[PDB]
Amino acid sequence: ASTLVNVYSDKSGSEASLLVGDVLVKDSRTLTLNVPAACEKVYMKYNTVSGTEATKEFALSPVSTGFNFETNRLASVTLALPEDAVQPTNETDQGYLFYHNTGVVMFEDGWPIQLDSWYDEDFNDVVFEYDLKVTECHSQQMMETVGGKEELLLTLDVRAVGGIYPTVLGVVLDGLKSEYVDRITASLILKGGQGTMTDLAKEELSTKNIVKVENKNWNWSNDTRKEPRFAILTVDKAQAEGTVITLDGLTSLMDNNQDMFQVTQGKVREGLPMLRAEVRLIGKEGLTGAERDAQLAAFRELILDTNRQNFFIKVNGGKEIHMRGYAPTSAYKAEYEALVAGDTTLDANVYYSNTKGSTWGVKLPVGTRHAYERVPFREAYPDFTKWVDSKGVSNQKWYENFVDEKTIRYW
Ligand SMILES: [Ca+2]
Ligand SMILES: [Ca+2]
Ligand SMILES: [Ca+2]
Ligand SMILES: [Ca+2]
Residue 396 Cα, ligand 2 centroid: separation in angstroms? Predict the structure, then answer.
């Protein structure tokens, strides 16, 4: 595996900035990557013939229908191995290529209600980090047609709940049909700040359409309350739109309605392990022809196409909120249509958006800090409206300009 390379969106070879891992580069290799919108170059880390690690910078090319709050873009890179690199042979290329995409999802819980200056909302009602890894479990890289299988590893980590009524967070893995998914592994975990993982529930390699794992009687070590908490992770691979993943139990994370969870100054719990949902989806083996190409594309497009990661939240009563331009689940579809029907403030042609192009959710770089309770998002991020109002043309790195006193970091 010493010849395989790692590609990052940052000079720092941080795990968060990894775009594609364990890549075989025989002569040259062109890859489509999902990169930060402002990103113009990528960094290939490689093993040298002396045993050290080196970095080579690569320029990005454009890949070729309006602005929709994307902090990412599609780009292309042509990798080439420098002459001092570990040269590939079957002795040094034993590794699976994997795509990587991570970010932080920030939701407002009030849909269909919003301030006219929608960015005056605090956007911390549900704050969760996600991490997606799609591994190509193939015997050899760079094939015309391929056997083996794909794997998907998703983590959903609850960072904060700045609302009284949010109950669920989830994602639709759009296009990831049941025909493509053989097994589901689903885990509820407490994610410690220094790499320690505590399992709350787990079901391994299930062939079920619906895998439900739950722990309805857990507490953090040295917890601030004696009352037990609960978490329910449901993986439904059999929905028409793709795999539907939900993490229920968000209401049990706070201690009271005034403070809520990880949002109120003086009440944030320092270094608190994060509630984590972890899902491993193992692709069907032995699928062939056109359908096999369709399967590999379905796993790949979840990382490549940002629009396939249909994140959402639920609030008490079952109301489902998605980001602008993202569809309700098939189950909520009828309710969504009945709800929006008489509302003059909502755009009838765009999902979950007011008539002035608002959103109730944003997907940001994973390190982006959320706002303190009732602090307007545009005050926590002074360059946000510049990016919004220029429709992503200016201040593409607006998320890097946060105001310390208006934002939280406890991890
Ligand atoms: Ca090989
Ligand atoms: Ca809010
Ligand atoms: Ca809030
Ligand atoms: Ca500070």
Answer: 24
